[PDB]
Each structure stands twice: as C-alpha cells, then as structure tokens.
Amino acid sequence: GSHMHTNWQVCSLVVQAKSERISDISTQLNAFPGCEVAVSDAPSGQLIVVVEAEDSETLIQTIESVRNVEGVLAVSLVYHQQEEQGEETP
Amino acid sequence: MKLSRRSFMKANAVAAAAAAAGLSVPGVARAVVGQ
Known part of the structure; x- marks a missing residue:
C-alpha cells in the first residue's frame, strides 16, 4: 500500500514443544505484545x-x-x- | 488492534521455517503460476 515500511528489531522463532504443550505456551506468546505467533501449525x-x-x-x-x-x-x-x-x- | 504485516511476514517466515524446521509449505509449493 504505497510507501510505508519501518521497523526496529524482530524475527520469527520456531518454538518446539509437546503437541499439546505448545498450544498452552505457544498460544501465550501471541498474547504478549513483543512476542507474537505468526504461523500456527x-x-x-x-x-x-x-x-x-x-x-x-x-x-x-x-x-x-x-x-x-x-x-x-x-x-x-x-x-x-x-x-x-x-x-x-x- | 494494529496488525498489518503478519500476512506479508508469514509468507517469508514460513519459507525459512519450513525448509529449516521442516514446517509446512504454505508459499514454498504453489508455484504453477508465474507473472
């Protein structure tokens, strides 16, 4: 959408935990402001x-x-x- | 909320998370279309 790009520092990390463990902790990362779940699989x-x-x-x-x-x-x-x-x- | 990038980032993130973490291939397969 037109020119508009600017960020400071952020990357995507793949957390590996029990299949139902991540649902508990992984989903939490999305609740935090800094941390955010991008792909849930x-x-x-x-x-x-x-x-x-x-x-x-x-x-x-x-x-x-x-x-x-x-x-x-x-x-x-x-x-x-x-x-x-x-x-x-x- | 102010969410306007997870759609564009997830496209590249999956490319480095799928070929590396063996994740799913969301934008690493559908390539029958060029242009």
Missing part, C-alpha cells in the same frame, strides 16, 4: 512466533522462556525481519 508440536525488542539482547531474553519451559523440547529460530537495508540471508 501442528506438524510435530512446534509453532512459529515472532518477537521484537529494543535490540537482540532483549530479543534473546524471550527465548529463555520457551527454552526453559518444559513443554518446549527444542527451539529453532532462524529468520530476520526488519525494514531498513539488505545484507544477510534467508
């Missing part, structure tokens, strides 16, 4: 949730919640989402 009990914060230091802080959560058995966050310039990979 039950392929193996893992959902995609993006989180934004002042900088990476605060962004990684959120992972401590999903990683420390027992329901979460694994965590694969690989996706940079920010409007400003290009110089990385998918």
Whole structure:
C-alpha cells in the first residue's frame, strides 16, 4: 500500500514443544505484545512466533522462556525481519 | 488492534521455517503460476 515500511528489531522463532504443550505456551506468546505467533501449525508440536525488542539482547531474553519451559523440547529460530537495508540471508 | 504485516511476514517466515524446521509449505509449493 504505497510507501510505508519501518521497523526496529524482530524475527520469527520456531518454538518446539509437546503437541499439546505448545498450544498452552505457544498460544501465550501471541498474547504478549513483543512476542507474537505468526504461523500456527501442528506438524510435530512446534509453532512459529515472532518477537521484537529494543535490540537482540532483549530479543534473546524471550527465548529463555520457551527454552526453559518444559513443554518446549527444542527451539529453532532462524529468520530476520526488519525494514531498513539488505545484507544477510534467508 | 494494529496488525498489518503478519500476512506479508508469514509468507517469508514460513519459507525459512519450513525448509529449516521442516514446517509446512504454505508459499514454498504453489508455484504453477508465474507473472
């Protein structure tokens, strides 16, 4: 829609937890302001949730919640989402 | 609420979350159309 793009720092993280565990914790990430569930799929009990914060230091802080959560058995966050310039990979 | 991007981001996020986390292929398959 016309010109309108501007962001600070945010990426998509794939939280891996028991099939019904993620529904409890994963759905919670969508309730938070910074963290937000982008893609909700039950392929193996893992959902995609993006989180934004002042900088990476605060962004990684959120992972401590999903990683420390027992329901979460694994965590694969690989996706940079920010409007400003290009110089990385998918 | 102010939600205006999860639709465009989910398109690219799934591309890096599906081919990496073996997630589903929402925009990584339907390609029979070009233009």
